[PDB]
Symmetry: C2
Subunit: 137 residues, 2 copies
């Protein structure tokens, strides 16, 4: 249970079927949507979740690196994949985050990635409910 609310992201999302749209309250996000894998030019929940988790993960890595007095490489990146899949009539997500951290000693890099996976609120939100493979790539 949150004690202090620091920021609220607000969106309005519409759909006419296969194609839709989502716009944030402040216009920062203004995107078209199309069903994942369909013919549409819009994005989808899997791409959105991959982007959002990856961003939050990098921020958590930066926090951890500060606490450890470690400088992260300029070329830090996360290549994420989020699958939609089924078992029977039931749908699930699963995720892979491949962290690119060139220049850091193995142990140092692993400690930072491990701290991030512990502190990242998206990682906390999904803990124990979906499979998540975090690797240094």
């Amino acid at each position: 249970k949150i004690e202090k609310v620091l920021y609220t992201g607000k969106t309005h999302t519409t759909s006419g079927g296969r194609d839709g749209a989502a716009r944030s309250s402040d216009g920062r996000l203004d995107i078209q949507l199309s069903s994942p894998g369909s013919a549409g030019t819009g994005t989808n929940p899997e791409q959105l979740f991959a982007a959002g988790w990856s961003a939050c993960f990098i921020g958590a890595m930066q926090l951890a690196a500060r606490a450890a007095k470690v400088t992260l490489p300029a070329d830090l990146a996360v290549d994420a994949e989020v699958d939609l899949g089924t078992a029977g009539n039931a749908y699930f997500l699963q995720a892979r985050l491949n962290v690119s951290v060139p220049g850091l000693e193995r142990d140092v890099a692993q400690r930072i990635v491990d701290a991030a996976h512990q502190t990242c609120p998206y990682s906390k939100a999904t803990r124990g409910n979906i499979d998540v493979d975090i690797r240094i790539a």
Copy 2:
């Protein structure tokens, strides 16, 4: 291994500089700048992205339920989502509110579709028990 068949994989490349960042999907369908919401930078953020993604996924689960029940959903269907980033102690957490608008649909049928979507939506499954989620129907 909950998944037996993978239907779709979304792929992204994300970088940040700690003030600006960027995320781009492999097929360029998503191509966004990121900014800290504590700045007035024009980039988006993980809370907006999560709000949008869950909303999109929720609508898709409603569409699935409505199709099977032979229900026509309003063309002006909408989900208004809010995702809070908050703290307890020095630790960060999310919570969410989804407000579903289905103008013209009888409230009985709306409740059936919404209650079904919250059970079957993969984002709702992925977060179950870890964060507070309030679902309302306008």
